[PDB]
Amino acid sequence: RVKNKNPAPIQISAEQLLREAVERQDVAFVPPKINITDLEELQ
């Protein structure tokens, strides 16, 4: 009936906001490492 004015059992908290905002980050970008197969690219 989408009219559930009943106060939520879990109220939104500020620390929750900052935590779930930070959660948007992931691991450091992983690039496929370059393979030095010969001497010139090593140089």
Binding site: K33, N35, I36, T37, D38, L39, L42
Partner: peptide, 24 residues
């Protein structure tokens, strides 16, 4: 010479390590 060579060999085995660790 040896440090360069060891770098080279590591590089081909890691280039082929993609096939080695393709499915794991």
């Amino acid at each position: 010479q040896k440090i360069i060579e060891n770098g080279i060999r590591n590089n081909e085995m890691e280039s082929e390590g993609r096939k080695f660790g393709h499915f794991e």
